[PDB]
Amino acid sequence: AHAASYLSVGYFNGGGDVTAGPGGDINKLDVTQITHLNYSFGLIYNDEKQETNPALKDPSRLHQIYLSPKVMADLQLLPVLRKQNPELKVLLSVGGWGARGFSGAAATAESRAVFIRSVQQVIKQYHLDGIDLDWEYPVNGAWGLVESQPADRANFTLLLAELHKALDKGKLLTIAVGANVKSPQEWVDVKGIAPYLDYINLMTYDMAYGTQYFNSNLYDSKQWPTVAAADRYSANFVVDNYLAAGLKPAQLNLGIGFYGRVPKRATEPGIDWDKADAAKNPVTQPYFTARETAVFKAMGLDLTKDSYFKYNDIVSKLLNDPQRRFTAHWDSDAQVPYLTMKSAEGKPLFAISYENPRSVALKADYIKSKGLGGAMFWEYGADDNNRLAHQLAESLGI
């Protein structure tokens, strides 16, 4: 009797990101193609001893939000964006990969009150529609990259309950959560925080690690299978894990990557920690040689440090490489594209998987069939002339 309504929540790396690099130009974005913009990132002033950003070590602002000069200048521009799309909602996202300070901000009644006052101050100064918290990750700390403790799980629940209480009615409160199965199991009380959140952004990407080839496959590949069980991920598997934990599909946005990654399997031995003497007996071995790593390095991707390739750069540098070194393929099971490069021996080598318009549309179909609330994407600055956002908008009837 009536049509569904869907969200399309676009993160934008405006201030810079640890894995994705320097911030983009906010003026390039087509804000008519999205329902919500998550301007990224606000950081957190913190007392973590390993913090290397000295601005954040100001003890007089501990637990408050830090906005860099570029973030402040870009947020000046919201009136212009809202005139372009008067239905747009704009949030600040706080955190991101490698961002410190959540564990300490969440830890006490006092610290949470300082952080919440700062959220309110920023929302009011910059006239935001809400706040998104991208803590990567409670309890796990991204394997040591940020401070963490087991109390983060319950403390995050308290922070969200208190922030929900403090926010003006009508303001949005959202979070991003990880793909890892331990996130709903051990890091985040998803069922307990659900009542406080307008929606939850699933980061259903960054799967091209360990023995897995694909970065954002919808289902598992059969032609290019992951070998170790602990590495075997797909977007659908992640969604099912979150549904198993008691979230309703309508509250979830499926995260879509406007980028790809060269799999770690290309350059690093893959270890299956379920195996006997695992580290000495890798189950996959690297198939890139100096020849292939040199190609990526020349494009600015040093694979010893980084595997992230923006979609617009995949199009310009890989698909449209003048030397024709990259061949485009489709994985029919995974429902995503990938490129190969030809070895000196003549064998196709799996170089990178990503999302193109066909695969973004197939993830929208999944959203529609599974009854998810919408899509989210990381991130708008990596789109090619707003094309992937436009596909999403079309597919979801935005």
- Residue 110 to residue 177: CA distance in whole angstroms: 25
Asked whether 128 and 118 are in contact (CB, 8 A), the reply is no
- Residue 346 to residue 6: CA distance in whole angstroms: 45
Neighbouring residues of 8: CB distance < 8 A, sequence distance ≥ 6:
33, 34, 35, 36, 374, 375, 376, 377, 389, 392, 393, 396, 398
- Residue 326 to residue 337: CA distance in whole angstroms: 12
Strand ordering across the sheet containing 348-353: 308-310, 259-261, 348-353, 336-342, 326-331
- Residue 84 to residue 92: CA distance in whole angstroms: 19
- Residue 96 to residue 22: CA distance in whole angstroms: 13
Asked whether 94 and 17 are in contact (CB, 8 A), the reply is no
Residue type, 203: M
Strands, DSSP E only, in the chain? 7-13, 36-44, 65-66, 89-95, 130-134, 172-177, 199-202, 252-257, 259-261, 308-310, 326-331, 336-342, 348-353, 374-378
Q: Is 371 left (phi over 0), alpha (psi -120 to 50) or beta?
A: left
DSSP one-letter code for 21:
B
Report residue 366 as tokens.
Answer: 């999944």
- Residue 168 to residue 330: CA distance in whole angstroms: 47
Which residues is 11 bridged to in the sheet? 38, 378
Asked whether 20 and 30 are in contact (CB, 8 A), the reply is no
Which residues is 336 bridged to in the sheet? 331
**Domains of the chain, first to last:** 1-257+355-398 (3.20.20.80), 258-354 (3.10.50.10)
- Residue 133 to residue 157: CA distance in whole angstroms: 12
Which residues is 207 bridged to in the sheet? none
Q: Which experimental approach was used here?
A: X-ray
For residue 41, say if its preceding peptide bond is cis, omega within 30 degrees of 0.
yes
Expressed in Å, this structure's resolution amounts to: 1.5
Angle between the N-to-C axes of helices 387-396 and 357-370, in degrees from 0 to 180, rounded to the nearest 10: 30
| Secondary structure (3-state) at 332 | coil
DSSP one-letter code for 70:
H
- Residue 303 to residue 307: CA distance in whole angstroms: 6
